[PDB]
PDB file of C-alpha atoms and ligand atoms in Angstrom:
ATOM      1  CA  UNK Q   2     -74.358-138.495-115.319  1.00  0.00           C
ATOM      2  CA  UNK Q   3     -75.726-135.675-117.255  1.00  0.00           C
ATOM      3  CA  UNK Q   4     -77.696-134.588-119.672  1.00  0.00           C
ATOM      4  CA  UNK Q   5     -76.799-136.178-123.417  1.00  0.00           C
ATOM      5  CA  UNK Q   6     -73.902-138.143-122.187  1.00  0.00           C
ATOM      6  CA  UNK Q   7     -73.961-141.485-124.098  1.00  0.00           C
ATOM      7  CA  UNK Q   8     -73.251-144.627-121.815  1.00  0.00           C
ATOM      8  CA  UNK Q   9     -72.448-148.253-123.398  1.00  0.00           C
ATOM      9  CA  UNK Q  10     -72.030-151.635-121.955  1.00  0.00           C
ATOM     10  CA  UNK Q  11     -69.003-153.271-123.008  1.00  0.00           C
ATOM     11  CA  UNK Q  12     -70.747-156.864-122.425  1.00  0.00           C
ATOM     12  CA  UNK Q  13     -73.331-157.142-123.844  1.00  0.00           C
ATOM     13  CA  UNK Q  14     -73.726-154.014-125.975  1.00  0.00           C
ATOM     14  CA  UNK Q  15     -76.395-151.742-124.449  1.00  0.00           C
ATOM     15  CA  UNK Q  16     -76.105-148.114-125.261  1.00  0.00           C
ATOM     16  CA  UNK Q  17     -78.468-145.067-123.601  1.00  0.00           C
ATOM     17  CA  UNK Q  18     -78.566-141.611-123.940  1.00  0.00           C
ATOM     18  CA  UNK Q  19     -79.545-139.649-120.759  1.00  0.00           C
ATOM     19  CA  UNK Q  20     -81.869-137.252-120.630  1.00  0.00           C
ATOM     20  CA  UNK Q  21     -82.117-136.544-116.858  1.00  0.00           C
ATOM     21  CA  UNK Q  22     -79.225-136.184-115.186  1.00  0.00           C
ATOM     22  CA  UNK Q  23     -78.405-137.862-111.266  1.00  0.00           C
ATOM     23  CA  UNK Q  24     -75.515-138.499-109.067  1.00  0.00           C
ATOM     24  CA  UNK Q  25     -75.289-142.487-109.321  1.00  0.00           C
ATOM     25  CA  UNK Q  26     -73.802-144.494-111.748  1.00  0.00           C
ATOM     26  CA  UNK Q  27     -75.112-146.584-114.822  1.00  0.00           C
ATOM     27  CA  UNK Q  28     -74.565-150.005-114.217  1.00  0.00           C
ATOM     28  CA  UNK Q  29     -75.208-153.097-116.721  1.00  0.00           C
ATOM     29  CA  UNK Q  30     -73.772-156.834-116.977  1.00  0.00           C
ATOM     30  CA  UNK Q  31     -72.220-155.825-113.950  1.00  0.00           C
ATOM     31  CA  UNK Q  32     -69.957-153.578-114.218  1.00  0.00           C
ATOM     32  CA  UNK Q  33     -69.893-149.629-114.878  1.00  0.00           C
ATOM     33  CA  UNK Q  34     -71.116-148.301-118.332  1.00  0.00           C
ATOM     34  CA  UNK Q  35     -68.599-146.594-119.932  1.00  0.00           C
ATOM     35  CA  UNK Q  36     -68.933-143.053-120.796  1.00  0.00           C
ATOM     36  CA  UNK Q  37     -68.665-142.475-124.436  1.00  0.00           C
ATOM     37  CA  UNK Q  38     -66.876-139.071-124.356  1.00  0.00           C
ATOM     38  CA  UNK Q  39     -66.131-137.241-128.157  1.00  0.00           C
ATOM     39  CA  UNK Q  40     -63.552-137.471-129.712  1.00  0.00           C
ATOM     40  CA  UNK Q  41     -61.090-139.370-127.855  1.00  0.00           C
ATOM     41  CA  UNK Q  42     -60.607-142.439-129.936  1.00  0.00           C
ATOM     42  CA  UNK Q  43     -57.574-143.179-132.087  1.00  0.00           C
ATOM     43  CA  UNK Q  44     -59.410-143.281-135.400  1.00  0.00           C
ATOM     44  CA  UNK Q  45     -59.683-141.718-138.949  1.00  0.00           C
ATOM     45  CA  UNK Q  46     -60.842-137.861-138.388  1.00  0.00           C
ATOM     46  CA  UNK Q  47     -61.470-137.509-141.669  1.00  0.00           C
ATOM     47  CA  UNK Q  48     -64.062-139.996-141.651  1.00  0.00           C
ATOM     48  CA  UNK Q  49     -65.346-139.594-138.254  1.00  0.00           C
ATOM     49  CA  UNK Q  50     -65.695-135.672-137.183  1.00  0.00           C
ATOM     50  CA  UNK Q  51     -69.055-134.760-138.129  1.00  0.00           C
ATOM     51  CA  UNK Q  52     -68.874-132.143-141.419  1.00  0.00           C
ATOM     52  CA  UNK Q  53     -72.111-129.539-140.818  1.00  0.00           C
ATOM     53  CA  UNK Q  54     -73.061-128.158-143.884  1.00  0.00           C
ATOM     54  CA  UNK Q  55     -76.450-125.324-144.268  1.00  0.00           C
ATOM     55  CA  UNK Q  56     -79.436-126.570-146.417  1.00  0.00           C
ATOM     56  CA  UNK Q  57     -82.756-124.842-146.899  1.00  0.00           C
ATOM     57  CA  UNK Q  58     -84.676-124.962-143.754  1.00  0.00           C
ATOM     58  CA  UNK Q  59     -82.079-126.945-141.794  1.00  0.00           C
ATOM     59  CA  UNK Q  60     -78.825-128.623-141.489  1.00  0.00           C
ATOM     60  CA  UNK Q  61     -77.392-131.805-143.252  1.00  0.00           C
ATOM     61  CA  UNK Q  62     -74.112-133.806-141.509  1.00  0.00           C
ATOM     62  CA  UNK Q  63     -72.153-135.951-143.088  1.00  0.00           C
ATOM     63  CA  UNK Q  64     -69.673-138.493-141.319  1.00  0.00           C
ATOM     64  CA  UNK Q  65     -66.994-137.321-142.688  1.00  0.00           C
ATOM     65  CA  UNK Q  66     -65.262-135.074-144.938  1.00  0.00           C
ATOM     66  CA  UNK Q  67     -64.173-138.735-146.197  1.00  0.00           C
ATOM     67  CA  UNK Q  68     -67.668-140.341-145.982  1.00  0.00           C
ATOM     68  CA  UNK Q  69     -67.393-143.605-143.115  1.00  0.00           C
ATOM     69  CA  UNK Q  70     -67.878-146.900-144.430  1.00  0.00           C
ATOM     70  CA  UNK Q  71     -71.514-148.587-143.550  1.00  0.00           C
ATOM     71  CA  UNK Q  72     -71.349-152.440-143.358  1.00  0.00           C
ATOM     72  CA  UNK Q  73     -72.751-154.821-141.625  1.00  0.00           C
ATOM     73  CA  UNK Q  74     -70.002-154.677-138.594  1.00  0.00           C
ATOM     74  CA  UNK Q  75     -68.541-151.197-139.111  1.00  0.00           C
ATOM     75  CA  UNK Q  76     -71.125-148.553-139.535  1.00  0.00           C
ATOM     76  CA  UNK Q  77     -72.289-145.223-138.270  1.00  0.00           C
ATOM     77  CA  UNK Q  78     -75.350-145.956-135.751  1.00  0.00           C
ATOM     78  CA  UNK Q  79     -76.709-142.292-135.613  1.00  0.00           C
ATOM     79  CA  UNK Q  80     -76.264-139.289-136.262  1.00  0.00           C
ATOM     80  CA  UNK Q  81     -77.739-136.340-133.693  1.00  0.00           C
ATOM     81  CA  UNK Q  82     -77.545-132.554-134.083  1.00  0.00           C
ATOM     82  CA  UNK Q  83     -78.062-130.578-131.078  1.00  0.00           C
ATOM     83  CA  UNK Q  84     -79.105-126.944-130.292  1.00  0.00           C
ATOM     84  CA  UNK Q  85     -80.297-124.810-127.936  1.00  0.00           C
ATOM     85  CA  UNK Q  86     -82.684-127.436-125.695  1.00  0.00           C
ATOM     86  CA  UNK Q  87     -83.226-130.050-128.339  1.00  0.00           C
ATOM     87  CA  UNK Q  88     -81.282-132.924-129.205  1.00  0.00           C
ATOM     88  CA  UNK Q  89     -82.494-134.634-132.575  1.00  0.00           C
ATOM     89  CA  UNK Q  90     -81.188-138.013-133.271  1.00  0.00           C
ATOM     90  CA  UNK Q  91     -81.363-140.020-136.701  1.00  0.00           C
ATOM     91  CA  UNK Q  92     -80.556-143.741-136.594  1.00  0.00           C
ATOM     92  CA  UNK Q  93     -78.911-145.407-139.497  1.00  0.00           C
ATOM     93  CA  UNK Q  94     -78.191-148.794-141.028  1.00  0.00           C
ATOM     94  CA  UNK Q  95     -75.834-150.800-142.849  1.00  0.00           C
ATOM     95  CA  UNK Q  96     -76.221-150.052-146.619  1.00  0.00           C
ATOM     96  CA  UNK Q  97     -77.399-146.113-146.341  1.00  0.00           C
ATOM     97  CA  UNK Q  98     -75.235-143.104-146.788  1.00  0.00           C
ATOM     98  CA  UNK Q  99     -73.263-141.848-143.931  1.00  0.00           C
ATOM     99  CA  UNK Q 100     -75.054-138.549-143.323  1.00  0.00           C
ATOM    100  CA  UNK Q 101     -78.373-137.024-141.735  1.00  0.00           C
ATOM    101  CA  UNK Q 102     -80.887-134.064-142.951  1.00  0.00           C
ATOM    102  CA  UNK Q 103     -82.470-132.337-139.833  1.00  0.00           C
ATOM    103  CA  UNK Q 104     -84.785-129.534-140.261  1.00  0.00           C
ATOM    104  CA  UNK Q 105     -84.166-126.826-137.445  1.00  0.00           C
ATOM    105  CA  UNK Q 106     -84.388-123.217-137.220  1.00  0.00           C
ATOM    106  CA  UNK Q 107     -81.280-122.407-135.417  1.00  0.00           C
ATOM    107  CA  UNK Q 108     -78.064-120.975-135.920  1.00  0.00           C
ATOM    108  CA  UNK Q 109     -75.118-122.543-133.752  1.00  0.00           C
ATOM    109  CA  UNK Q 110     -75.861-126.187-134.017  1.00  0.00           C
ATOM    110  CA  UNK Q 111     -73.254-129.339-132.559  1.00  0.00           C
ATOM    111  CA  UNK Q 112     -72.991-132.263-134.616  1.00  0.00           C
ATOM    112  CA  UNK Q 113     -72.403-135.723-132.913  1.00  0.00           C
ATOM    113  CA  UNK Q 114     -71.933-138.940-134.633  1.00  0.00           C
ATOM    114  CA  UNK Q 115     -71.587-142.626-133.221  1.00  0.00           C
ATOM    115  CA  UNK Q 116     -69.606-145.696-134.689  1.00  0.00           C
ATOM    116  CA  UNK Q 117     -70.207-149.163-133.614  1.00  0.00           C
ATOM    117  CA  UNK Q 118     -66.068-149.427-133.527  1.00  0.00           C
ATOM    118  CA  UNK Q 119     -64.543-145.619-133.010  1.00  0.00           C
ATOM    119  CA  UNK Q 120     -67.156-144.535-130.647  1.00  0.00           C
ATOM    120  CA  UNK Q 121     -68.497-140.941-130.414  1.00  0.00           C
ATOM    121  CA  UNK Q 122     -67.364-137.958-132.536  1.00  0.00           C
ATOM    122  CA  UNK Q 123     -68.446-134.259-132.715  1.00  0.00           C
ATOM    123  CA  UNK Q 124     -68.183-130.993-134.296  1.00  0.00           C
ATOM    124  CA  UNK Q 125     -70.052-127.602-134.215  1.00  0.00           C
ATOM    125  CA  UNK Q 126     -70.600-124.660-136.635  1.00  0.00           C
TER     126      UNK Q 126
ATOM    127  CA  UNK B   2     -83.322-153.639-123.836  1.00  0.00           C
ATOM    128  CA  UNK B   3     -84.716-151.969-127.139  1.00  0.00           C
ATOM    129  CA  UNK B   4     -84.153-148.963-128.948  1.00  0.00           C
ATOM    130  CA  UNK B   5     -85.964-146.010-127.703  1.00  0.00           C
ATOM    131  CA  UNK B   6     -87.068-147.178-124.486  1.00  0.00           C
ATOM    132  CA  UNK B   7     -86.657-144.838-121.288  1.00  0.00           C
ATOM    133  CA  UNK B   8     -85.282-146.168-117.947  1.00  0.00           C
ATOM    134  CA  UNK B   9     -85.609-144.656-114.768  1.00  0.00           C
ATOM    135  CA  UNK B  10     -83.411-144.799-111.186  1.00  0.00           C
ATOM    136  CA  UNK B  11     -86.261-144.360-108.372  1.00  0.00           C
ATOM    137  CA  UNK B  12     -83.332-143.701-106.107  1.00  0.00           C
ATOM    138  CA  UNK B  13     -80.965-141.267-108.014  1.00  0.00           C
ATOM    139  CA  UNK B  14     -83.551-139.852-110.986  1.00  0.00           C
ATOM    140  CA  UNK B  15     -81.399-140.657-113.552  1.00  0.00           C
ATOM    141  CA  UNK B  16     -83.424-141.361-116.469  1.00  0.00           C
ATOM    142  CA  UNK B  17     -81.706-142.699-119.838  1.00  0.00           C
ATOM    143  CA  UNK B  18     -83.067-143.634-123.654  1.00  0.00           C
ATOM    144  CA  UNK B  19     -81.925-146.508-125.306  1.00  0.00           C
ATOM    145  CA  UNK B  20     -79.653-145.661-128.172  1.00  0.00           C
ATOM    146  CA  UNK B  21     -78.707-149.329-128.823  1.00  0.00           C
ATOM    147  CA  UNK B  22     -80.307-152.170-127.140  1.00  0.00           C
ATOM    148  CA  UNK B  23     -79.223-155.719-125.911  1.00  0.00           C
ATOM    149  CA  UNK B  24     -79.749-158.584-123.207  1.00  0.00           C
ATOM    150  CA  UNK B  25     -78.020-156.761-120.490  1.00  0.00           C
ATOM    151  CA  UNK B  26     -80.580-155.221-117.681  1.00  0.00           C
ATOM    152  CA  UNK B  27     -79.665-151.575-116.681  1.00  0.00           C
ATOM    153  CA  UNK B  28     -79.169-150.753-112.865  1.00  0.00           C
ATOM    154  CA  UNK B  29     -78.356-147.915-111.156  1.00  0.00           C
ATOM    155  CA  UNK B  30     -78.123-147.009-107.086  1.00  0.00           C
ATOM    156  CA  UNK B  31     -77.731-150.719-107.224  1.00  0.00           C
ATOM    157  CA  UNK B  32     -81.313-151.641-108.017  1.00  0.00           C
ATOM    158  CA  UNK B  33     -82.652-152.350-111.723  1.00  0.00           C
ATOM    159  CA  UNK B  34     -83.876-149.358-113.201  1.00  0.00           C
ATOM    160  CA  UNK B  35     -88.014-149.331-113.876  1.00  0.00           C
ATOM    161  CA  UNK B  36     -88.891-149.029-117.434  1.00  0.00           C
ATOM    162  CA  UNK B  37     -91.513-146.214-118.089  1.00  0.00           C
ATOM    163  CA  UNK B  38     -93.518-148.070-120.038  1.00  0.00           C
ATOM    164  CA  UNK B  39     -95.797-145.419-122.035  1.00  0.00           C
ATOM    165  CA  UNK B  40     -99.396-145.094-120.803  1.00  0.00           C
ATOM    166  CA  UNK B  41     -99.518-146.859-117.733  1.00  0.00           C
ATOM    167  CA  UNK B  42     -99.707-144.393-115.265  1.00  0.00           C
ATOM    168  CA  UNK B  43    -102.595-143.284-112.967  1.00  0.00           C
ATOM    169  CA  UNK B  44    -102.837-139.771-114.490  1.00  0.00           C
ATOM    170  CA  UNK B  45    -105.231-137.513-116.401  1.00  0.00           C
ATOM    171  CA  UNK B  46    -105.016-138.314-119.882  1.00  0.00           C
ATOM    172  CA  UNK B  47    -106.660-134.900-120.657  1.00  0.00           C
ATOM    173  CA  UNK B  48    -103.179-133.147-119.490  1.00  0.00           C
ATOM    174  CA  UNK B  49    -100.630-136.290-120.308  1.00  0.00           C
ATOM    175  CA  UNK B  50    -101.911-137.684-123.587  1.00  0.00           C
ATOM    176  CA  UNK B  51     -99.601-135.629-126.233  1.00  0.00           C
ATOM    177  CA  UNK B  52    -101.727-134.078-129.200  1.00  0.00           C
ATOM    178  CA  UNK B  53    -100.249-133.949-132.744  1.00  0.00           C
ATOM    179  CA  UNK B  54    -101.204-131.067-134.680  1.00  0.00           C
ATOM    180  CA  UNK B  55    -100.278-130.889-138.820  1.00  0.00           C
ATOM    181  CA  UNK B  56     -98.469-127.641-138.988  1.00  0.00           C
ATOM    182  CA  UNK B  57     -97.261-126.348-142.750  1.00  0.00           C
ATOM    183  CA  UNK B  58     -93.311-128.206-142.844  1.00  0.00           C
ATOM    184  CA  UNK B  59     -94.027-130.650-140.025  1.00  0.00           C
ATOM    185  CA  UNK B  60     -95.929-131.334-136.357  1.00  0.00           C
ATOM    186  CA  UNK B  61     -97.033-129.097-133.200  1.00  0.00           C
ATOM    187  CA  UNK B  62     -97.059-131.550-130.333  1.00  0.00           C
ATOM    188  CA  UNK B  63     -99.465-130.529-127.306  1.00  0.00           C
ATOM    189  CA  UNK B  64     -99.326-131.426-123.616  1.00  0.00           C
ATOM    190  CA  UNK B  65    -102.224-131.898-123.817  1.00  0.00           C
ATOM    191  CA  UNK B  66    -105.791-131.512-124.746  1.00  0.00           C
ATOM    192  CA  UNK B  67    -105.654-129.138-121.693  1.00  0.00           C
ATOM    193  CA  UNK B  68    -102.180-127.764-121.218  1.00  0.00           C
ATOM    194  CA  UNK B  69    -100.181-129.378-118.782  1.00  0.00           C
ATOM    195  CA  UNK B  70     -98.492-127.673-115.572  1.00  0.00           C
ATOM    196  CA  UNK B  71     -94.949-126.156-116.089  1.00  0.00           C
ATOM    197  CA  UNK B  72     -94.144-125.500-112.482  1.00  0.00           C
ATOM    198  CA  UNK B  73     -90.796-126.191-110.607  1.00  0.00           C
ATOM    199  CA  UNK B  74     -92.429-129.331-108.877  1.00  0.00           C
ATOM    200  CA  UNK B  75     -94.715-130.643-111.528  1.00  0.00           C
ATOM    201  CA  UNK B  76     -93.285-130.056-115.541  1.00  0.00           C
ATOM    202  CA  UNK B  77     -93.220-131.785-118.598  1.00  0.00           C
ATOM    203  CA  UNK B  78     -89.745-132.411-119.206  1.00  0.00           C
ATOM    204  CA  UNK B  79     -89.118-133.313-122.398  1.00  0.00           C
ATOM    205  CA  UNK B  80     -91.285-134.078-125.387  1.00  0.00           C
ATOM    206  CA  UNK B  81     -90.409-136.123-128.636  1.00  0.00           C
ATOM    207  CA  UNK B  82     -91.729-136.804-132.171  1.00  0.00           C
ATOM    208  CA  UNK B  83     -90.585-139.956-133.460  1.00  0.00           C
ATOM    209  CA  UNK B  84     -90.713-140.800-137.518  1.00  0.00           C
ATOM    210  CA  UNK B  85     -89.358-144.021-139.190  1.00  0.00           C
ATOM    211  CA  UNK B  86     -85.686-144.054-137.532  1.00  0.00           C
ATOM    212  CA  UNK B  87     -85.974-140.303-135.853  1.00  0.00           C
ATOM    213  CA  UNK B  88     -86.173-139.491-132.442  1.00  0.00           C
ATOM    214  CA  UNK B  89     -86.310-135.696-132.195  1.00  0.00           C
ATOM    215  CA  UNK B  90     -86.304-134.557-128.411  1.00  0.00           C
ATOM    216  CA  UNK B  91     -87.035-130.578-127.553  1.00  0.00           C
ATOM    217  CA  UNK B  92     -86.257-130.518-123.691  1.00  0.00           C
ATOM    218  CA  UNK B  93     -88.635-128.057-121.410  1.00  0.00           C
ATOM    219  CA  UNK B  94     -88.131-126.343-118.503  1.00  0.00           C
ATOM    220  CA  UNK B  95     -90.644-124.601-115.559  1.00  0.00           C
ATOM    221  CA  UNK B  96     -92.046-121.437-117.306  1.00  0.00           C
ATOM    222  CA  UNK B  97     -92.571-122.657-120.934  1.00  0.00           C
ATOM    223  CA  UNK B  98     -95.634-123.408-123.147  1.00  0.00           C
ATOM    224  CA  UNK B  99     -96.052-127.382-122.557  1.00  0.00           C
ATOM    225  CA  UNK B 100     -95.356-128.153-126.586  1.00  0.00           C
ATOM    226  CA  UNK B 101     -92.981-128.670-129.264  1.00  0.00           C
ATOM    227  CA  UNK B 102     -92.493-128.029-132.877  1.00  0.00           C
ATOM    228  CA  UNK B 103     -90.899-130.385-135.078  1.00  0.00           C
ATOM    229  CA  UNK B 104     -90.038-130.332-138.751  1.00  0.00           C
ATOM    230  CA  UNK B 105     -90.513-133.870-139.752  1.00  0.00           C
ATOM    231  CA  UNK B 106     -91.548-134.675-143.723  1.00  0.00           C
ATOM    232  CA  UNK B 107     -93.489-137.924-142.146  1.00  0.00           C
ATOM    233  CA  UNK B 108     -97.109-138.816-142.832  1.00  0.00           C
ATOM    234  CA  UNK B 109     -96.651-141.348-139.401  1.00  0.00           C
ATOM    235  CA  UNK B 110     -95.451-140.237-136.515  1.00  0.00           C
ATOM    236  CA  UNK B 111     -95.363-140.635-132.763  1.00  0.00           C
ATOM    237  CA  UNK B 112     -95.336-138.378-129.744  1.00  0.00           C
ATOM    238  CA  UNK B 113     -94.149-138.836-126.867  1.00  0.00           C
ATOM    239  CA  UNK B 114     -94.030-136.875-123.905  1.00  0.00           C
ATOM    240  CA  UNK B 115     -92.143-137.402-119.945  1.00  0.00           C
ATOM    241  CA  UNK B 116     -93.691-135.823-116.863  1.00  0.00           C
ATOM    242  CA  UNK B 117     -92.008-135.568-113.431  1.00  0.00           C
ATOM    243  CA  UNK B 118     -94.119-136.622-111.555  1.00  0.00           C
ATOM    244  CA  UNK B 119     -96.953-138.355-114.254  1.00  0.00           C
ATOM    245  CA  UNK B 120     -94.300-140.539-116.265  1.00  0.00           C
ATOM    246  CA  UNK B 121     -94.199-141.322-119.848  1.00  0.00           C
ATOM    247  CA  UNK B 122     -97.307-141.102-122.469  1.00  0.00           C
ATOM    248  CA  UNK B 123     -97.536-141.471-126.224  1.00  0.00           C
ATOM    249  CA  UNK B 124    -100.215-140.866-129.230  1.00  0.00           C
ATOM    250  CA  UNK B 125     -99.862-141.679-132.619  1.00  0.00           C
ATOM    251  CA  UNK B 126    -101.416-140.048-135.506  1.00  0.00           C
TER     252      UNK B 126
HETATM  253 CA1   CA L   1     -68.333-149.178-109.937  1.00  0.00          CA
HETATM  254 CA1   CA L   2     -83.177-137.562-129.451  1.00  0.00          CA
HETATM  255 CL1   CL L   3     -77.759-132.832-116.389  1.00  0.00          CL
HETATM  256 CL1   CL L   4     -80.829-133.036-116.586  1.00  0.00          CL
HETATM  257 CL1   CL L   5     -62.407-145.869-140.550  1.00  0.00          CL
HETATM  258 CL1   CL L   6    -102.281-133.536-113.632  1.00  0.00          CL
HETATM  259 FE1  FE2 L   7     -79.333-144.090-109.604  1.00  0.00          FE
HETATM  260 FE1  FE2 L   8     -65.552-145.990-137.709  1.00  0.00          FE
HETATM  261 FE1  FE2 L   9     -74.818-155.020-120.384  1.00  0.00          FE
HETATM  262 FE1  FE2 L  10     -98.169-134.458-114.896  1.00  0.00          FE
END
């Protein structure tokens, strides 16, 4: 695995982030974790790439350039913005707006977003 | 498994964060992976216990009271400020100051930091 990958268990649900890469491989319920690799489901672009727009002192994403529905059982989990050696995540909930505001000084950013149904999506500016 | 926890592979080093948790227990190299449960290690608290410093538009986090090592075999590795549902995470490498600056409109946060060799330790303001 490496760095930032995102892993889930399709049993029971389990998701992880790593954050130091190593040769063997993530196990749970018994049997391999899937890698969650971006934007490789068949799903809605338009609600799932990330959208990166500037705001003073930062970045804010929104999920998408159709904003993703957030209900109980279909809902963006997080949403993470990564740059240079930092990778800041923001959970979310059923109920709250499908976007994040992340305050970073930095100037080429990636966007990634995760839904509990069309897995993981990203962009970059 | 719960959300932000951080599992370690003694045999590989992978080390993961939870993202989303659930019943399932991870494993890797075909043993259960330890959880680095914060504060537990036999350490010096004067170089492992993260200090948060109010900074004008958000934290300074310190490793630590005396600054850590940042050598090739003995490093903080990451270190993280965690607000509500944030988990910001500025990565480190051999060389660098042992601290982080995050721009977090919180009054409550939480630090965290991961040492190679020292493990995983947390302060709160
Ligand atoms: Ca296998
Ligand atoms: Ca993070
Ligand atoms: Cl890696
Ligand atoms: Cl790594
Ligand atoms: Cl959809
Ligand atoms: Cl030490
Ligand atoms: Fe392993
Ligand atoms: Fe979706
Ligand atoms: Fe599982
Ligand atoms: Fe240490």
């Amino acid at each position: 695995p490496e760095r930032l990958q995102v892993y889930k268990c399709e049993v029971c649900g389990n998701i992880v982030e790593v954050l130091n890469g190593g040769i063997g491989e993530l196990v749970c319920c018994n049997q391999d974790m899937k890698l969650m690799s971006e934007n490789t489901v068949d799903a809605a672009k338009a609600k799932h790439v990330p959208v990166i727009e500037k705001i003073d002192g930062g970045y804010k994403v929104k999920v998408g350039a159709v904003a993703h529905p957030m209900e109980e059982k279909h809902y963006i989990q997080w949403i993470e913005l990564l740059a240079d050696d930092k990778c800041y995540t923001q959970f979310l909930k059923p109920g709250q707006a499908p976007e994040a505001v992340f305050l970073i000084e930095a100037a080429k950013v990636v966007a990634r977003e995760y839904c509990n149904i069309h897995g993981h999506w990203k962009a970059e500016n």
